[PDB]
Each structure stands twice: as structure tokens, then as C-alpha cells.
Design an enzyme around this catalytic site. Structure first.
Site, PDB file in Angstrom:
ATOM      1  N   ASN A   1      33.188  32.455  44.596  1.00  0.00           N
ATOM      2  CA  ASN A   1      34.609  31.608  45.342  1.00  0.00           C
ATOM      3  C   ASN A   1      35.370  32.680  46.528  1.00  0.00           C
ATOM      4  O   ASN A   1      35.381  34.098  46.839  1.00  0.00           O
ATOM      5  CB  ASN A   1      35.256  31.688  44.095  1.00  0.00           C
ATOM      6  CG  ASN A   1      36.543  32.920  43.598  1.00  0.00           C
ATOM      7  OD1 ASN A   1      37.266  33.192  44.244  1.00  0.00           O
ATOM      8  ND2 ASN A   1      35.493  33.594  43.046  1.00  0.00           N
TER       9      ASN A   1
ATOM     10  N   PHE B   1      43.944  32.998  47.370  1.00  0.00           N
ATOM     11  CA  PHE B   1      44.994  33.466  46.458  1.00  0.00           C
ATOM     12  C   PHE B   1      46.103  31.890  46.465  1.00  0.00           C
ATOM     13  O   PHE B   1      46.792  31.985  46.892  1.00  0.00           O
ATOM     14  CB  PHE B   1      45.844  34.028  46.306  1.00  0.00           C
ATOM     15  CG  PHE B   1      45.198  35.968  46.068  1.00  0.00           C
ATOM     16  CD1 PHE B   1      46.123  37.639  46.837  1.00  0.00           C
ATOM     17  CD2 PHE B   1      44.999  36.292  44.936  1.00  0.00           C
ATOM     18  CE1 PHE B   1      45.608  38.631  46.027  1.00  0.00           C
ATOM     19  CE2 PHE B   1      43.949  37.085  43.977  1.00  0.00           C
ATOM     20  CZ  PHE B   1      44.966  38.077  44.695  1.00  0.00           C
TER      21      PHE B   1
ATOM     22  N   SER C   1      40.917  40.973  44.488  1.00  0.00           N
ATOM     23  CA  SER C   1      40.211  40.289  45.057  1.00  0.00           C
ATOM     24  C   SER C   1      39.454  40.805  46.333  1.00  0.00           C
ATOM     25  O   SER C   1      40.126  41.020  46.876  1.00  0.00           O
ATOM     26  CB  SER C   1      41.364  39.239  45.282  1.00  0.00           C
ATOM     27  OG  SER C   1      40.936  38.183  46.010  1.00  0.00           O
TER      28      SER C   1
ATOM     29  N   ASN D   1      39.051  38.494  48.689  1.00  0.00           N
ATOM     30  CA  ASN D   1      39.201  37.519  49.609  1.00  0.00           C
ATOM     31  C   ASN D   1      40.439  37.534  50.070  1.00  0.00           C
ATOM     32  O   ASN D   1      40.979  36.567  51.050  1.00  0.00           O
ATOM     33  CB  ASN D   1      38.861  36.221  48.327  1.00  0.00           C
ATOM     34  CG  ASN D   1      37.684  36.100  47.997  1.00  0.00           C
ATOM     35  OD1 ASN D   1      36.386  36.611  48.911  1.00  0.00           O
ATOM     36  ND2 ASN D   1      37.669  35.427  46.776  1.00  0.00           N
ATOM     37  N   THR D   2      41.423  38.497  50.028  1.00  0.00           N
ATOM     38  CA  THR D   2      42.135  39.255  51.281  1.00  0.00           C
ATOM     39  C   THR D   2      42.625  40.368  51.503  1.00  0.00           C
ATOM     40  O   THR D   2      41.587  41.617  51.126  1.00  0.00           O
ATOM     41  CB  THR D   2      43.444  39.304  49.676  1.00  0.00           C
ATOM     42  OG1 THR D   2      44.460  37.623  49.061  1.00  0.00           O
ATOM     43  CG2 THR D   2      44.854  39.631  50.611  1.00  0.00           C
TER      44      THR D   2
ATOM     45  N   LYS E   1      44.024  45.229  37.584  1.00  0.00           N
ATOM     46  CA  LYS E   1      42.687  44.831  37.805  1.00  0.00           C
ATOM     47  C   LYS E   1      41.967  45.537  38.675  1.00  0.00           C
ATOM     48  O   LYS E   1      42.167  45.174  39.686  1.00  0.00           O
ATOM     49  CB  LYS E   1      42.460  43.060  37.374  1.00  0.00           C
ATOM     50  CG  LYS E   1      41.621  42.636  37.687  1.00  0.00           C
ATOM     51  CD  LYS E   1      41.517  41.528  37.489  1.00  0.00           C
ATOM     52  CE  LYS E   1      40.056  40.762  36.978  1.00  0.00           C
ATOM     53  NZ  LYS E   1      40.281  39.174  36.915  1.00  0.00           N
TER      54      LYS E   1
ATOM     55  N   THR F   1      36.007  43.854  35.288  1.00  0.00           N
ATOM     56  CA  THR F   1      36.420  44.252  36.404  1.00  0.00           C
ATOM     57  C   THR F   1      36.360  42.730  36.879  1.00  0.00           C
ATOM     58  O   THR F   1      36.360  41.719  36.510  1.00  0.00           O
ATOM     59  CB  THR F   1      34.891  44.403  37.407  1.00  0.00           C
ATOM     60  OG1 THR F   1      33.568  43.527  37.460  1.00  0.00           O
ATOM     61  CG2 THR F   1      34.327  45.769  37.061  1.00  0.00           C
ATOM     62  N   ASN F   2      36.868  42.703  38.387  1.00  0.00           N
ATOM     63  CA  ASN F   2      36.954  41.499  39.400  1.00  0.00           C
ATOM     64  C   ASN F   2      35.742  40.823  39.846  1.00  0.00           C
ATOM     65  O   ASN F   2      34.811  41.561  39.244  1.00  0.00           O
ATOM     66  CB  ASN F   2      37.774  41.802  40.523  1.00  0.00           C
ATOM     67  CG  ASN F   2      38.788  40.365  40.880  1.00  0.00           C
ATOM     68  OD1 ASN F   2      38.041  39.656  40.753  1.00  0.00           O
ATOM     69  ND2 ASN F   2      40.057  40.363  40.973  1.00  0.00           N
TER      70      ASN F   2
ATOM     71  N   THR G   1      33.704  31.898  34.258  1.00  0.00           N
ATOM     72  CA  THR G   1      32.482  31.548  34.300  1.00  0.00           C
ATOM     73  C   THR G   1      31.564  30.846  34.054  1.00  0.00           C
ATOM     74  O   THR G   1      31.307  30.199  33.866  1.00  0.00           O
ATOM     75  CB  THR G   1      31.313  32.391  35.860  1.00  0.00           C
ATOM     76  OG1 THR G   1      32.451  32.952  36.699  1.00  0.00           O
ATOM     77  CG2 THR G   1      30.408  31.639  36.051  1.00  0.00           C
TER      78      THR G   1
HETATM   79  C1  FMN Z   1      37.135  30.564  40.963  1.00  0.00           C
HETATM   80  C2  FMN Z   1      37.221  31.946  40.444  1.00  0.00           C
HETATM   81  C3  FMN Z   1      38.812  32.167  40.572  1.00  0.00           C
HETATM   82  C4  FMN Z   1      39.096  33.732  39.995  1.00  0.00           C
HETATM   83  N1  FMN Z   1      40.845  33.715  40.896  1.00  0.00           N
HETATM   84  C5  FMN Z   1      41.018  34.626  39.949  1.00  0.00           C
HETATM   85  C6  FMN Z   1      42.414  35.089  40.461  1.00  0.00           C
HETATM   86  O1  FMN Z   1      42.717  34.172  40.661  1.00  0.00           O
HETATM   87  N2  FMN Z   1      42.883  36.348  40.127  1.00  0.00           N
HETATM   88  C7  FMN Z   1      41.843  37.531  39.123  1.00  0.00           C
HETATM   89  O2  FMN Z   1      42.552  38.642  39.452  1.00  0.00           O
HETATM   90  N3  FMN Z   1      41.037  36.999  39.032  1.00  0.00           N
HETATM   91  C8  FMN Z   1      40.151  36.080  39.549  1.00  0.00           C
HETATM   92  N4  FMN Z   1      39.218  35.601  39.511  1.00  0.00           N
HETATM   93  C9  FMN Z   1      37.925  36.537  38.591  1.00  0.00           C
HETATM   94  C10 FMN Z   1      38.224  36.527  36.966  1.00  0.00           C
HETATM   95  O3  FMN Z   1      39.511  36.859  36.125  1.00  0.00           O
HETATM   96  C11 FMN Z   1      36.762  37.121  36.311  1.00  0.00           C
HETATM   97  O4  FMN Z   1      37.765  38.606  36.983  1.00  0.00           O
HETATM   98  C12 FMN Z   1      35.540  37.293  37.278  1.00  0.00           C
HETATM   99  O5  FMN Z   1      35.174  35.584  37.488  1.00  0.00           O
HETATM  100  C13 FMN Z   1      34.291  38.476  36.085  1.00  0.00           C
HETATM  101  O6  FMN Z   1      34.177  37.233  35.237  1.00  0.00           O
HETATM  102  P1  FMN Z   1      33.416  36.138  34.740  1.00  0.00           P
HETATM  103  O7  FMN Z   1      31.790  36.598  35.021  1.00  0.00           O
HETATM  104  O8  FMN Z   1      33.639  35.476  33.064  1.00  0.00           O
HETATM  105  O9  FMN Z   1      33.477  34.856  35.081  1.00  0.00           O
HETATM  106  C14 FMN Z   1      38.342  34.317  39.553  1.00  0.00           C
HETATM  107  C15 FMN Z   1      37.539  34.011  39.357  1.00  0.00           C
HETATM  108  C16 FMN Z   1      36.619  33.146  39.515  1.00  0.00           C
HETATM  109  C17 FMN Z   1      35.247  32.442  39.583  1.00  0.00           C
HETATM  110  O1  ORO Z   2      40.011  34.333  45.803  1.00  0.00           O
HETATM  111  C1  ORO Z   2      40.841  34.110  44.496  1.00  0.00           C
HETATM  112  O2  ORO Z   2      41.689  33.511  44.662  1.00  0.00           O
HETATM  113  C2  ORO Z   2      39.886  35.350  43.885  1.00  0.00           C
HETATM  114  C3  ORO Z   2      39.414  35.564  43.550  1.00  0.00           C
HETATM  115  C4  ORO Z   2      38.121  36.560  42.858  1.00  0.00           C
HETATM  116  O3  ORO Z   2      37.242  36.711  42.643  1.00  0.00           O
HETATM  117  N1  ORO Z   2      39.258  37.341  42.241  1.00  0.00           N
HETATM  118  C5  ORO Z   2      40.750  36.937  42.828  1.00  0.00           C
HETATM  119  O4  ORO Z   2      41.117  37.827  41.798  1.00  0.00           O
HETATM  120  N2  ORO Z   2      40.875  36.371  43.931  1.00  0.00           N
END
Ligand code: FMN
Ligand code: ORO
Ligand code: BCE
Length: 361
Positions: free
Chosen positions: A110, A114, A180, A182-183, A220, A248-249, A322
Site C-alpha cells: 500500500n 495518510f 510510514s 508513504n510520506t 511505532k 513494526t510498520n 493483512t
Molecule cells: C492498507 C494498509 C494501510 C495501513 N495504514 C497504516 C496507518 O495508517 N498507520 C500505521 O501506523 N500503520 C498502517 N499500516 C501498517 C499496519 O498497521 C501494520 O504495521 C503492518 O501492515 C504490518 O502488519 P500486517 O502484516 O498484519 O498487516 C497499514 C497497513 C496496510 C496493509
Molecule cells: O500509506 C499509509 O497511509 C500508511 C501505510 C503504511 O503501510 N503504514 C503507515 O503508517 N501509513
């Protein structure tokens, strides 16, 4: 609620009818209305961060970015809910498409960037159910609020400060999301000097809230940090008395072996290919903080074994996202059931006994 049906029929059909973002939006909608398909034992209860958690399995930030589906998520069986990331002002995020599935890898990429309804909208949404949440928390179902920063902000620290002031009073814990991918420039806030300055401000603002409205503060972090980065984060956390870490992120790495056609899309990679990279980061951060700093372990959790590996590595709590997108809601009960069975099998009296167990052998 049947695991096979969701895993073999419902989810693949959903994935074949909608693009990933559309599927995500419909899921939030369905969850918010409580249109969904396990009895938590005392073995799964964890006391950390000044709260009781009836089970250690939470929904990771990103699924419910705007606080729309909190109650539906508790109904799904999560022991705690984290919403966000939330930015001070509303913003759209990156242009579409910005979410990609890698089914062959049980992974997602992804680059949302934000997308956020902003603090004011989320504040009022949480206020509408604030007393309901107070009772949920007391019942062992805490709420976390994950803070981000606006794309065009000139002062990163002030963005997070505003988040603390506005949503801090509504949260059991706050997450300073500096990870993140993505910023632009966001992950540089993980650096020692930047982090210390940022977290000093955040903690001052938090300490200024009235006692019943005073959340724990967690940071985070990325799975892509150097050894030096991790040393520095551990140092700052201990210096400032940060309440915990989320580890982790998503990763900007693309591990050898990815099969998905969409593997070379820009963004954060999540799911199975992230799992052990995350576990190892938990393991390192636990050691560097002497087991004294609560860790929420996240990344590639899809089973009881995945959960327990992170717990033994040093996590007090875990989160998933996920896995939900591949297996649907039944994965929550599955993870909890498998975790319980594994704790019994390995001689642990409960989750608490297993926290950091690998470091003691
Ligand atoms: C679609 C998508 C959007 C996410 N948005 C955020 C976010 O807004 N802020 C954040 O701290 N992590 C965000 N994450 C990261 C997840 O919180 C998590 O740290 C990461 O996906 C690993 O966990 P997982 O493998 O179970 O998905 C996002 C992940 C995905 C899949
Ligand atoms: O694009 C986001 O908003 C986003 C994605 C992601 O994987 N982690 C996060 O902290 N933000
Ligand atoms: C980014 C994301 O959330 C997805 C992708 N791709 C996704 O499929 N999410 C999702 C999450 C939950 C559900 C779901 C399925 C059944 C009942 C309630 C929710 C369906 C889809």
C-alpha cells in the site's frame, strides 16, 4: 463463522469482484454496521500500559483509519482496537490505485499516504461513543489512537502535538507514527535528535492532560532500521520514559522470493514476507530496552504460532491487519484458539508468562 468458507469461498470471490481499496471500504462499512460472522479464557488476559487486555490480539492501524468501525472490530473478537493514522487536517492521500494484493505471497503493498478525515471529524466520532468506550476499556477492551502528520505541514512536531491535544483525551494509548514509508521525510523523524525533540514535545503535551484523560504514549517504528537507528531509538525511549513501542510498520524492502505480479509497486509491504523481519525487530528492541518497555508486535501475524513467536521474542501484545484481508474475520478466533493451545503445550500459565521467554532460555 467458518474458517474454510471465508478462506476458500467468500474472500477469494470478494477479491475477484472488487479492487483492494473498494474491498477495504466495503469491509469498513460492513464492520461498522456489525454485519459479521470464541470465548476468551483467562490465559489470554494481559495487563500492560496501565490497562487490562482481555486477549492480546488487536487490529493494527490502517484498517479503521477514521474511527468508523471500532465497535464492530471488538465484536470481531479483537482484544483492543487501534484507529488511524489520523492527520491534523483532512487530506486525500495518494492518487488511486494505491493498494495492491500479492496473493501468491499472502502480502499487500500500500501507498495510501495518510488519507484521513482529520482530527476534528475523528474527535466527534469518538466523542459520540466516549462513555461506551470507557466501559469497554474497564472491561478489558482498550482503544488506541494512531497519529500521523499532514503532507504539507512545516512543523512535524506541532502536528503530533495537535493530535495529542485533540485525541489524547479519548484514547487509552497514543501512537506517534514515525514509520510510514508513504510520506516523504517522515521516517527521518526516527533519527536520534529528531525523535528526542519530537517525543519531548509529545510527552509534555500528554502530561498536560487531566489524569483520567492521560494516555500512554508509544512510538511505532519501521522494520527497515539500521542497528544504529535501533540503538538510538532504545536510548531515547529510556531517556524520556516512553511508555512503549509498536514494532513494526510496513517494509520498503522487497524480500527475495516475492511472486506477486505487483511486487515492484511502490509502497509498504505487509503480510507473510514481513513476518520474521518484524519478529527479529521485536527481539532486538526488547533486548536493547532490557525487557522494561512494553512492545506491541505487528507484521505478518496470521496464526497462533505467529502470535506466540512475537510474544516469546518480547511482545506483550500483537496486532494483525493483512491476514484479515486474506482469511476474513474467522482469522481472529483462529489466532486466539491456536495461541491458547500453544501456550498450554509449551508449559506457559498464560500470555504474561511467555512474554520475552526466548531471552531467558
Ligand atoms: C492498507 C494498509 C494501510 C495501513 N495504514 C497504516 C496507518 O495508517 N498507520 C500505521 O501506523 N500503520 C498502517 N499500516 C501498517 C499496519 O498497521 C501494520 O504495521 C503492518 O501492515 C504490518 O502488519 P500486517 O502484516 O498484519 O498487516 C497499514 C497497513 C496496510 C496493509
Ligand atoms: O500509506 C499509509 O497511509 C500508511 C501505510 C503504511 O503501510 N503504514 C503507515 O503508517 N501509513
Ligand atoms: C486493504 C484491505 O483492507 C483489503 C484488501 N485488499 C481487504 O480485503 N480488507 C477486508 C477486510 C475485512 C473484510 C471482511 C470480510 C467479511 C466481513 C467483514 C470484513 C473484507 C476485506
Amino acid at each position: 463463522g467458518d474458517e474454510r468458507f471465508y478462506a476458500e469461498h467468500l474472500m477469494p470471490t470478494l477479491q475477484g469482484l472488487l479492487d483492494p481499496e473498494s474491498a477495504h471500504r466495503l469491509a469498513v462499512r460492513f464492520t461498522s454496521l456489525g454485519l459479521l460472522p470464541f470465548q476468551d479464557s483467562d490465559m489470554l488476559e494481559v495487563r500492560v500500559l496501565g490497562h487490562k487486555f482481555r486477549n492480546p490480539v488487536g487490529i493494527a492501524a490502517g484498517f479503521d483509519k477514521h474511527g468508523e468501525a471500532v465497535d464492530g472490530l471488538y465484536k470481531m473478537g479483537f482484544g483492543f482496537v487501534e484507529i488511524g493514522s489520523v492527520t491534523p487536517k483532512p487530506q486525500e492521500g495518494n492518487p488511486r490505485p494505491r493498494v495492491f494484493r500479492l496473493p501468491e505471497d499472502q502480502a499487500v503493498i500500500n501507498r495510501y499516504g495518510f488519507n484521513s478525515h482529520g482530527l476534528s471529524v475523528v474527535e466527534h466520532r469518538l466523542r459520540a461513543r466516549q462513555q461506551k468506550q470507557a466501559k469497554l476499556t474497564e472491561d478489558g477492551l482498550p482503544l488506541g489512537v494512531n497519529l500521523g502528520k499532514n503532507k504539507t505541514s512545516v512543523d512535524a512536531a506541532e502536528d503530533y502535538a495537535e493530535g495529542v491535544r485533540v485525541l489524547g483525551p479519548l484514547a487509552d494509548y497514543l501512537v506517534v507514527n514515525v514509520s510510514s514509508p508513504n510520506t516523504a521525510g517522515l521516517r527521518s523523524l526516527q533519527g536520534k535528535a529528531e525523535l528526542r525533540r519530537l517525543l519531548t514535545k509529545v510527552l509534555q503535551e500528554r502530561d498536560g492532560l487531566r489524569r483520567v484523560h492521560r494516555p500512554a504514549v508509544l512510538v511505532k517504528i519501521a522494520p527497515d532500521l539500521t542497528s544504529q537507528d535501533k540503538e538510538d531509538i532504545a536510548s531515547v525511549v529510556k531517556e524520556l520514559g516512553i511508555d512503549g513501542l509498536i514494532v513494526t510498520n510496513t517494509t520498503v524492502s522487497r524480500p527475495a522470493g516475492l511472486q506477486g505480479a505487483l511486487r515492484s509497486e511502490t509502497g509498504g509491504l505487509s503480510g507473510k514476507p514481513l513476518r520474521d523481519l518484524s519478529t527479529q525487530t521485536i527481539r532486538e528492541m526488547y533486548a536493547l530496552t532490557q525487557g522494561r518497555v512494553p512492545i506491541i508486535g505487528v507484521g505478518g501475524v496470521s496464526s497462533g504460532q505467529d502470535a506466540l513467536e512475537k510474544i516469546r521474542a518480547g511482545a506483550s501484545l500483537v496486532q494483525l491487519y493483512t491476514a484479515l484481508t486474506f482469511w476474513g474475520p474467522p482469522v481472529v478466533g483462529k489466532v486466539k484458539r491456536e495461541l491458547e493451545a500453544l501456550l498450554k503445550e509449551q508449559g506457559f500459565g498464560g500470555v504474561t508468562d511467555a512474554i520475552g521467554a526466548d531471552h531467558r532460555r
